[PDB]
Ligand binder design. Sequence first.
Ligand SMILES: CC(=O)N[C@H]1[C@H]([C@H](O)[C@H](O)CO)O[C@@](O[C@H]2[C@@H](O)[C@@H](CO)O[C@@H](O[C@H]3[C@H](O)[C@@H](O)[C@H](O)O[C@@H]3CO)[C@@H]2O)(C(=O)O)C[C@@H]1O
Ligand SMILES: CC(=O)N[C@H]1[C@H]([C@H](O)[C@H](O)CO)O[C@@](O[C@H]2[C@@H](O)[C@@H](CO)O[C@@H](O[C@H]3[C@H](O)[C@@H](O)[C@H](O)O[C@@H]3CO)[C@@H]2O)(C(=O)O)C[C@@H]1O
Ligand SMILES: CC(=O)N[C@H]1[C@H]([C@H](O)[C@H](O)CO)O[C@@](O[C@H]2[C@@H](O)[C@@H](CO)O[C@@H](O[C@H]3[C@H](O)[C@@H](O)[C@H](O)O[C@@H]3CO)[C@@H]2O)(C(=O)O)C[C@@H]1O
Lengths: 290, 291, 295
Amino acid sequence: LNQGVTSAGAPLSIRNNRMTMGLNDGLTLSGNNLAIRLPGNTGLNIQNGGLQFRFNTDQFQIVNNNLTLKTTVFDSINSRIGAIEQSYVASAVTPLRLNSSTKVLDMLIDSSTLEINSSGQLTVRSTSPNLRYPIADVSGGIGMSPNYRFRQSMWIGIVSYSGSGLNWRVQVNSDIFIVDDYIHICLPAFDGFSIADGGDLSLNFVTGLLPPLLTGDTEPAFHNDVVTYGAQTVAIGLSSGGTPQYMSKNLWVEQWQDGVLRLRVEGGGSITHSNSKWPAMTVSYPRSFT
Amino acid sequence: VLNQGVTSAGAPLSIRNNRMTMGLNDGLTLSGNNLAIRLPGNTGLNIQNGGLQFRFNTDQFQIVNNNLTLKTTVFDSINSRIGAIEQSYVASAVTPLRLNSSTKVLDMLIDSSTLEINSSGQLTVRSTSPNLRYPIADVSGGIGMSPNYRFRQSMWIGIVSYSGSGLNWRVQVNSDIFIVDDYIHICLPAFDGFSIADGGDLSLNFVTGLLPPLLTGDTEPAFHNDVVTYGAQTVAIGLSSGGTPQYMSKNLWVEQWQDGVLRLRVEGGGSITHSNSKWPAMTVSYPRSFT
Amino acid sequence: SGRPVLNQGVTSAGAPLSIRNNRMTMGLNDGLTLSGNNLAIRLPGNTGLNIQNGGLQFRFNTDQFQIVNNNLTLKTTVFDSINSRIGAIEQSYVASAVTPLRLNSSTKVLDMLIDSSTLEINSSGQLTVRSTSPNLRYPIADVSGGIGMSPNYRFRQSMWIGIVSYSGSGLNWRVQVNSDIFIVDDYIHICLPAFDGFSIADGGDLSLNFVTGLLPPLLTGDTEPAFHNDVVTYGAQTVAIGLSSGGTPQYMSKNLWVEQWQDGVLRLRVEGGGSITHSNSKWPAMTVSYPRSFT
Ligand SMILES: CC(=O)N[C@H]1[C@H]([C@H](O)[C@H](O)CO)O[C@@](O[C@H]2[C@@H](O)[C@@H](CO)O[C@@H](O[C@H]3[C@H](O)[C@@H](O)[C@H](O)O[C@@H]3CO)[C@@H]2O)(C(=O)O)C[C@@H]1O
Ligand SMILES: CC(=O)N[C@H]1[C@H]([C@H](O)[C@H](O)CO)O[C@@](O[C@H]2[C@@H](O)[C@@H](CO)O[C@@H](O[C@H]3[C@H](O)[C@@H](O)[C@H](O)O[C@@H]3CO)[C@@H]2O)(C(=O)O)C[C@@H]1O
Ligand SMILES: CC(=O)N[C@H]1[C@H]([C@H](O)[C@H](O)CO)O[C@@](O[C@H]2[C@@H](O)[C@@H](CO)O[C@@H](O[C@H]3[C@H](O)[C@@H](O)[C@H](O)O[C@@H]3CO)[C@@H]2O)(C(=O)O)C[C@@H]1O
């Protein structure tokens, strides 16, 4: 006659009419009750009536009872990356050059045509103009060489007369003026001897020109052509030791040959005479150039 | 006196034929003879440190307010890389620099009339010739003075006409013509003519007789057709009736150019009765018109 | 056994077991519950915990998380998209610039420094060379857009209305003349008209006072010779002057030249050719030229 408990299955056990329960770590006594033991704080908690897992709600969420990352935890990142992607420089076209390693951007330039200003600005390399005399640099700009516009010199030499067997020479001191493309030889008045109706007066430029003027500087632009250039009247006083009679003769530049300028002197009739008084005469003609 | 004790039990305990047993669902099991929590596999749960704990990579996660939270260090590398780019990078380009945001290509806009890219990828200014106006011209590569302006020679073969006080006559002559800088020089030779008046005109007809490429217009003075007294000078003219000429000192000047005809005034110095005149060679010069 | 009270079966129990009126029960905290007749772990809601595979398991997205050494670990693939997008930018991007290229690191704006005098940005936004007027010096000048010769240098005309004064061995007098003036290249030409004067000597001076009488744009200084105030024998020529005392003129072939310009007065020398007794002089028209001073 017994209706009590005389044996028990694990985790229950009986000793001397007293029953106890064996518990592994994880299960514990809480007051009079059996409880799940959760040491420390590892995201597990007894709450809302049972065992739950706890997670930051800004970083995590539960989807089909699975722990899942909140898609927003990445938004800040993708936002910053999308900001750069939408508009940035990845490649550069010449003259632009991009070193993909040091990520430095520079530009290729021709050093003969372009340069870098002290203030880092791109400037066109200034160049001096290529000029040919009489065009020249005048106080910094493209101008006309002063030497072309006016050059003064001097000739101290021999004038020779020759006509119909009559011959004689005189020495003159003469200013020379070169102005643009003309030379002017300013012969002074002088005395000579008999002259023919027609004859030539020769200026020997082979010697007597003041340095640095040279014989070749007196060559006409028509070189050694025979011309009738600069024709004019000259009044020459003819006498035989008394009052001279003035004859109106015709004079022109006739020919330059090897540094000797020949002038023709003819016309106006003549008289018997032994001496001639010549006026100052300026003789001009276009000058040779290179 | 018998104390017979427990005779019934409530779930999860039950008694049958004097034996008590405890029923268990999955999750609860026996570890020997002790009650235990069942954790199949490896899902982050473990019995450790006295009980049930959740396990996590300590470099990626931390526990804050007993809440599983992402450790910030996890993003440190991402934040450093993006920050390194953000601090300095090109997002926009100002002209002439151009940025195509859809291809990430940076190029530059250049005017192809003044600039270009050479064979070595360098930016170079186009070579350009100076813009020059005659008589300034290119002389052997440089900016110089046109040789043609400095000296040009031609020739006129034509008629000089005298006119004075009902006297008229003509003489065919040839004459070299020299144009030098802004002057023209017409080099007439000596010639014989007929009776002249005390005062009168000598006219050169340039409408014909000029040697190509010279044209009539090239003989126009810089003062055009105004009446002037230019290049006044003395000319001795021999007058006679067949005998020995008597030379009159007359006064000659350029008076007017009209329709290709250059008129020279010739007057002064007196006159005598005569039928013939011996004219000296005369050079006529004046500043010449230009464009 | 003299024991006054005999215990049979189970008469007491340790917590969590308890006995009331011969019934044994189990006390349970939240987290433990009854599923039918069985003890069960209670998992309220859905928080990643589940009874499955025979026990208590934790559930996680298998694309985002993984288990290493029974630890919850972030699956490395979840940052792959981010690491590639960033890396793509890294391999090639402009971080810095070298002058004249200029990058504002704070606005992400790239531009280029240029000289405003030698370079410009045209209408179509291109970089173009600034068209610049060449540095010229008169008489070289701009002529309809090209480097040319100033028309003013090539030919300029005016007039002098003034006094010509004769002086010579006591004989002196003056006459008013209107004279065209032409300046051509580096020369000045004074075109004196014919005029009448009084007694002249064998040698004498004819002076032109340019201090007054010049018509603008000409000024006195414009008549200075290129040889300044040197005494010269320039442009020497023959001039026939008619001498008389009321009757028939006798024409003397005299010799005239430009001799000296001083303080705006151009002095011409007139000598030679003999002379006679006379009270009147009939001068011809005479053009006087010389090279002109410049700057
Ligand atoms: C996630 C968590 O909170 N874990 C706790 C656990 C769980 O709450 C428990 O395992 C669920 O069954 O408990 C831990 O022990 C604490 C717990 O027993 C409570 C119960 O009241 O007492 C805490 O300290 C008490 C202490 O008993 C008193 O003497 C003291 O005067 O007051 C304290 C509280 O103010 C226990 O420490 C555990 O280790 O299992 C603590 C975990 O953090
Ligand atoms: C995270 C982890 O380590 N999971 C283990 C678990 C847990 O450690 C365990 O549930 C905590 O209580 O153990 C696992 O292996 C056990 C499992 O096969 C059970 C099934 O009943 O048997 C266990 O051996 C027991 C056995 O059941 C008893 O008869 C014996 O008297 O005691 C043994 C020791 O407790 C295994 O250890 C599991 O699957 O639950 C393996 C997981 O990896
Ligand atoms: C993570 C999870 O699944 N949580 C469940 C839990 C766990 O399954 C359980 O605690 C583990 O032991 O169960 C919850 O209760 C549900 C559970 O008891 C089932 C058992 O079959 O019944 C559900 O009630 C339903 C029932 O299924 C229907 O037959 C009935 O007609 O309607 C009821 C609902 O009105 C329980 O909801 C729990 O809260 O512990 C539910 C969790 O979501």
